[PDB]
């Protein structure tokens, strides 16, 4: 994973996202959704999804939330106050903690001012607590600004490492982007049916055709402009649409 003071930032893009494999995986110790309850994720579409990744203590997972305070949310990773995404977290004691102490996971514990939301700060200047200038050397009131979790496998819960992923769905002003997968039933024939062909909503009897579209045309129309043929997206065969009987 990535440190807590330099988190990563992956920009998921145009794709088919299935948040159900996430939501029901039961391997996550924390799955909170804020802008939007979890079950309705596989039914919406946004412009961009960002995924941020890092590693923290066990009992600092409560500062990854909109409107908190503490050494993590103050100056390591700040979430805006109208967050939209979801926060996922799971214990990772066996991967990240090693006997003798894993001193490779640092965090920032001194900064001049709290972070703006989604702001990032990887500098390593000597912090200056008191009024006396520091001149790049340590000493009283001149502190190195990074400390390291010394993780060890015999730590009580709440001191073992947790891995965190923060998904943030954003909606700029584009034309569209990633959405959840569209599931399909079977196509029946020779029965007055209520059908939807990737947008085309209608009613009628479906029948095997013998016309030949051009290999970019989806549906056919009549004179007086009524849909009378379609192409099945999955198998790519033309089917006529006749109305079911009235009189």
């Amino acid at each position, epitope marked *: 994973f990535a440190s807590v003071y330099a988190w990563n930032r992956k920009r998921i893009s145009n794709c088919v996202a299935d948040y159900s494999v996430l939501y029901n995986s039961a391997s996550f110790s924390t799955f909170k959704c804020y802008g939007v309850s979890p079950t309705k994720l596989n039914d919406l579409c946004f412009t961009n999804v960002y995924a941020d990744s890092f590693v923290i*203590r066990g*009992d*600092e997972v*409560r*500062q990854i939330a909109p409107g*908190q*305070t*503490g*050494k993590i949310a*103050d100056y390591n990773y700040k979430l805006p106050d109208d967050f939209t995404g979801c926060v996922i977290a799971w214990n990772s004691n066996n991967l990240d903690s090693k*006997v*003798g*102490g894993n001193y490779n996971y640092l965090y920032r514990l*001194f900064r001049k001012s709290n972070l703006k939301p989604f702001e990032r700060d990887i500098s390593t200047e000597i912090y200056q*607590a*008191g*009024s006396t200038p520091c001149n790049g050397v*340590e000493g*009283f*009131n001149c*502190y*190195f600004p990074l*400390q390291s*979790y*010394g*993780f*060890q496998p015999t*730590n*009580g819960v709440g*001191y073992q490492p947790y891995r965190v992923v923060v998904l943030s769905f954003e909606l700029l002003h584009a034309p569209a982007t990633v959405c959840g997968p569209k599931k399909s039933t079977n196509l029946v024939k020779n029965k007055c049916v209520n059908f939807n062909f990737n947008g085309l909503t209608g009613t009628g009897v479906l029948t095997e055709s013998n016309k030949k579209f051009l290999p970019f045309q989806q549906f056919g129309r009549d004179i007086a402009d009524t849909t009378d043929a379609v192409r099945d997206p999955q198998t790519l065969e033309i089917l006529d649409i006749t109305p079911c009987s009235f009189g």
Partner: antibody, heavy 119, light 117 residues
Framework: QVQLVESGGGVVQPGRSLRLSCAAS????????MHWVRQAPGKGLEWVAV????????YYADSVKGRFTISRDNSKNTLYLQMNSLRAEDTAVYYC????????????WGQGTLVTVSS | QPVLTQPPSSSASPGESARLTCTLP?????????IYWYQQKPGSPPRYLLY?????????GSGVPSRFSGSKDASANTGILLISGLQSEDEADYYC??????????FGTGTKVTVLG
């Protein structure tokens, strides 16, 4: 289980030298950082010295520098402290403490031992 | 190195609630550090109690009943220990500590507490 015993205390005149031995047990000695912390008779606590898990971070205290040497031996699970040129004021009770790092605090102190710099 | 001033010898009577304070110097925004609290009975080594930084960043000490609670008030440069419901087993010295940079460990100056029996 985990328990730290200490020895080496006594009475000396200033200028001489002394060494203290903190023998551990229980836990696995060579996985932790160890401190020496002193307190005068009738005063507050005062940190003296630290040593990593042999990580060679000595980091003495501004009042002990150039006079105290801290060291360890995990082959015998032993922490040492060598004092020399005693200021006839470093008369106190000394404890060895274990440092729980990812929480950031001491635990498992060791009952201390008394050394008096008389004349 | 900073000096952590502590008023010696507070006191109260059983069932009451004592409020100890630990203040730094005119400099340093005590709302920038986490404060640790230790307790020492006579004839015994000290013992960790809790630490406080900015509620929702608290932490207790494995055997410390929920009586002891820490807080922190900004415009006095002061951290606060709060015992609620004193008993006849809190006669001890309470030290406040800060740990800035694994280079120095600063202790308070001590504070006696006695429950008037």
């Amino acid at each position: 289980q985990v328990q730290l015993v200490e020895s080496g205390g006594g009475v000396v005149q200033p200028g001489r030298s002394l060494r203290l031995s903190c023998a551990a047990s229980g836990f696995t000695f060579s996985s932790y950082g160890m401190h020496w912390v002193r307190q005068a008779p009738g005063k507050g606590l005062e940190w003296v010295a630290v040593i990593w898990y042999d990580g060679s971070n000595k980091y003495y205290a501004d009042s002990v520098k150039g006079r105290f040497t801290i060291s360890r031996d995990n082959s015998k699970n032993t922490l040492y402290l060598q004092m020399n040129s005693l200021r006839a004021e470093d008369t106190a009770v000394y404890y060895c403490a274990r440092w729980f790092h990812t929480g950031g605090y001491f635990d498992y102190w060791g009952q201390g031992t008394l050394v008096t710099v008389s004349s | 190195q900073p000096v952590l001033t502590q008023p010696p010898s507070s006191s109260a009577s059983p069932g009451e609630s004592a409020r100890l304070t630990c203040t730094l110097p005119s400099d340093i925004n005590v709302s920038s550090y986490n404060i640790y609290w230790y307790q020492q009975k006579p004839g015994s080594p000290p013992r960790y109690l809790l630490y406080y930084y900015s509620d929702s960043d608290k932490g207790q000490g494995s055997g410390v009943p929920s009586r002891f609670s820490g807080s922190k008030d900004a415009s006095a440069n002061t951290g606060i220990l709060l015992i609620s419901g004193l008993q006849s087993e809190d006669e001890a010295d309470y030290y406040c500590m800060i740990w800035p940079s694994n280079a120095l460990y600063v202790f308070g100056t001590g504070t006696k507490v006695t429950v008037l029996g």
